[PDB]
Design a protein around this ligand. Sequence first.
Ligand code: HEM
Length: 89
Amino acid sequence: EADLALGKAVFDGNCAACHAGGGNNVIPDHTLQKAAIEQFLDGGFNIEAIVYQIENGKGAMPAWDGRLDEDEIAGVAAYVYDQAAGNKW
Ligand code: HEM
C-alpha cells in the first residue's frame, strides 16, 4: 500500500543520480535528511510536499509528472519519507 520496495527501485533508477546516500550533489545542504527537508522543502516534512516537488520539479531538480506514474511517485515519496524518518541513510 505504501510500497517501499517499489519506491527504492524508482529511487535507484531516477533519483540516485543526484541523491544517492541521501545527499544532494547539486545543492549540498538540501539533503534528504529530515531536518534539511523541514528547513528547505517548500511545504515541510510531509508526503504531499515531497510529492509536489517530485511532480513539479524545483530549480535544478527536474519535474517527473508524466514520466513516472502515480504509483511510482507515491512509492518513491514514501521511501524518501521512511528513510528520513528512520534515520536510515
Ligand atoms: C527522484 C524522483 C527524486 C526524488 C525522490 C527527489 C527528492 C527530493 C527532495 C525530497 C528534495 C528536498 C530536499 C531538501 O532538503 O529540501 C529534493 C531537492 C532537490 N533535488 Fe531532488 N529528487 C529526485 C531527483 C532529483 C534529480 C535527478 C536531481 C539532480 C538532477 C535532483 C536535484 C535536486 C535539487 C537541486 C534539489 C534542491 C532544489 C531547491 O531547493 O532549489 N533531484 N529532491
